[PDB]
Design an enzyme around this catalytic site. Structure first.
Site, short mmCIF file in Angstrom:
data_model
loop_
_atom_site.label_atom_id
_atom_site.label_comp_id
_atom_site.label_asym_id
_atom_site.label_seq_id
_atom_site.Cartn_x
_atom_site.Cartn_y
_atom_site.Cartn_z
N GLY A 1 0.77 -1.21 0.00
CA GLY A 1 0.00 0.00 0.00
C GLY A 1 0.82 1.28 0.00
N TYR B 1 -9.49 -0.42 -3.16
CA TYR B 1 -10.48 -0.20 -2.11
C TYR B 1 -11.85 -0.30 -2.75
CZ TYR B 1 -6.70 2.07 0.67
OH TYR B 1 -5.58 2.34 1.43
N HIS C 1 -6.34 11.11 8.98
CA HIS C 1 -4.96 10.66 9.03
C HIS C 1 -4.06 11.46 8.06
CE1 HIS C 1 -6.46 8.67 5.47
NE2 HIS C 1 -5.19 8.48 5.11
N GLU D 1 -0.45 10.36 5.74
CA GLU D 1 0.18 9.13 5.28
C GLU D 1 1.30 8.60 6.18
OE1 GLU D 1 -1.36 7.75 2.44
OE2 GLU D 1 -2.62 9.38 3.24
N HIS E 1 -6.33 14.15 6.03
CA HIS E 1 -7.55 13.97 5.24
C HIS E 1 -8.45 12.87 5.84
CE1 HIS E 1 -4.32 11.58 3.46
NE2 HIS E 1 -5.25 10.72 3.07
N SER F 1 -4.70 3.23 -4.76
CA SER F 1 -3.73 4.22 -4.31
C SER F 1 -2.39 3.68 -3.89
CB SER F 1 -4.30 5.13 -3.23
OG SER F 1 -4.79 4.41 -2.16
O1 LIG Z 1 -10.10 4.22 1.68
C1 LIG Z 1 -9.87 5.36 1.24
O2 LIG Z 1 -10.67 5.93 0.50
C2 LIG Z 1 -8.62 6.11 1.59
C3 LIG Z 1 -8.52 7.42 1.12
C4 LIG Z 1 -7.39 8.17 1.42
N1 LIG Z 1 -6.41 7.63 2.15
C5 LIG Z 1 -6.49 6.35 2.61
C6 LIG Z 1 -5.33 5.87 3.40
O3 LIG Z 1 -5.34 4.73 3.87
O4 LIG Z 1 -4.37 6.66 3.55
C7 LIG Z 1 -7.61 5.54 2.36
NI NI Z 2 -4.63 8.62 3.02
#
Ligand SMILES: O=C(O)c1ccnc(C(=O)O)c1
Ligand code: NI
Ligand SMILES: [Zn+2]
EC number: 1.14.11.66
Length: 350
Positions: A165, A172, A183, A185, A271, A283
């Site tokens: 990841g 997802y 969170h 990153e 975010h 991602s």
């Molecule tokens: O699951 C998500 O949409 C998402 C979006 C942005 N960031 C993450 C993350 O795990 O950092 C997950």
């Molecule tokens: Ni994220």
């Protein structure tokens, strides 16, 4: 400190010619001050597609789907994960579109957003999150999440270490009311998010320059969590409504991502958000030279084994040779200016 003074979420429509060199376009959006919001949208050129079609993926396995149990009240919530048995995309989509879990009817997004915050503790949904894979065709050369060619590649190059990841792609599979908590990153990296198909994904963001205000507030509301971990937001269990952020003076913006759009998050850009209905996103993380200082200074979860820690040594030796010995002897006192674009943006600033 003059570009994007309001730190608002910016959107970009590059041409195919602008689109081609991923790293150079990130350096461009930073020259425009995009990084100040913590979150930017890039709408790719019309002729660009990452996959012929998605007709063939029903049999793809979601090995560990997660039921999201949310507890809380009055804008403050903790999300608990219940690991369910593996299921195929076919199985997942049937649950997502069923009467029990489907998106409710609505007029404006403001309406759906109210229903999300009103209902997030009821009828816990299932998120097919953290699936190891990519839906990019192998030939796709532009903005391919499986190979972005950023300096983050130095991790695998120098040590052989792959972090799922983080330097590899995740898929997802969403349904209505599935969430991602507040969170930044791992290692305060950048991230790229592509919505391959389905219903939208809505995002909230706090500017990196105001990240600390968010932490101070999170720490106040969740004092037990804070006493037991140096970085509990990294557990990705903490939901905080934008009305709470408004009430305590945290600047934030919001944006909705549609199918076929990228979202970029920037170092230390907090975010959070939710999916509207059945969708699929992909991602990974990435770096620029600007990230190196964030990496050196990131506060990491101190309570979980299997938490992502990247050795910064290689990055400091290579890109900051004059500070290497200082940094090593624990004396590197650099203070991050969040407004500063990455060095690579020089090109675009006269
Ligand atoms: O699951 C998500 O949409 C998402 C979006 C942005 N960031 C993450 C993350 O795990 O950092 C997950
Ligand atoms: Ni994220
Ligand atoms: Zn922790």
């Amino acid at each position: 400190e003059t570009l994007n003074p309001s730190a608002r979420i910016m959107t970009f429509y590059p041409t195919m010619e602008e689109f081609r060199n991923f790293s150079r376009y990130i350096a461009y959006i930073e020259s425009q001050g995009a990084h100040r919001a913590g979150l930017a949208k890039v709408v790719p050129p019309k002729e660009w597609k990452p996959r012929a079609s998605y007709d063939d993926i029903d049999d793809l396995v979601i090995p560990a789907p997660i039921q999201q149990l949310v507890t809380g009240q009055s804008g403050l919530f903790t999300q608990y994960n219940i690991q369910k048995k593996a299921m195929t995309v076919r199985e997942f989509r049937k649950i997502a579109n069923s009467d029990k879990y489907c998106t409710p009817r609505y007029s404006e997004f403001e309406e759906l957003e109210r229903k999300y915050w009103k209902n997030l503790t009821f009828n816990p949904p299932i998120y097919g999150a953290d699936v190891n894979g990519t839906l990019y065709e192998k030939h796709v050369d532009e903005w391919n999440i499986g190979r972005l060619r950023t300096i983050l590649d130095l991790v695998e190059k120098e040590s052989g270490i792959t972090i799922e990841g983080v330097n590899t792609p995740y898929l997802y599979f969403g349904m209505w009311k599935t969430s991602f908590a507040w969170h930044t990153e791992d290692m305060d990296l950048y991230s790229i998010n592509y919505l391959h198909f389905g219903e939208p994904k809505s995002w909230y963001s706090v500017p990196p320059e105001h990240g600390k205000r968010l932490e101070r507030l999170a720490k106040g509301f969740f004092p037990g969590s804070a006493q037991s971990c140096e970085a509990f937001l990294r557990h990705k269990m903490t939901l905080i409504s934008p009305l709470m952020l408004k009430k305590y003076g945290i600047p934030f913006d919001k944006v909705t991502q549609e199918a076929g759009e990228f979202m970029i998050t920037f170092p230390y850009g907090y975010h959070a958000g939710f999916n509207h209905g059945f969708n699929c996103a992909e991602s990974t993380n990435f770096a620029t030279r600007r990230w190196i200082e964030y990496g050196k200074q990131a506060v990491l979860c101190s309570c979980r084994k299997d938490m992502v820690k990247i050795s910064m040594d290689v990055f400091v030796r290579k890109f900051q040779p004059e500070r290497y010995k200082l940094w090593k002897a624990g004396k590197d006192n650099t203070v991050i200016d969040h407004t500063l674009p990455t060095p690579e943006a020089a090109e675009f600033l006269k």
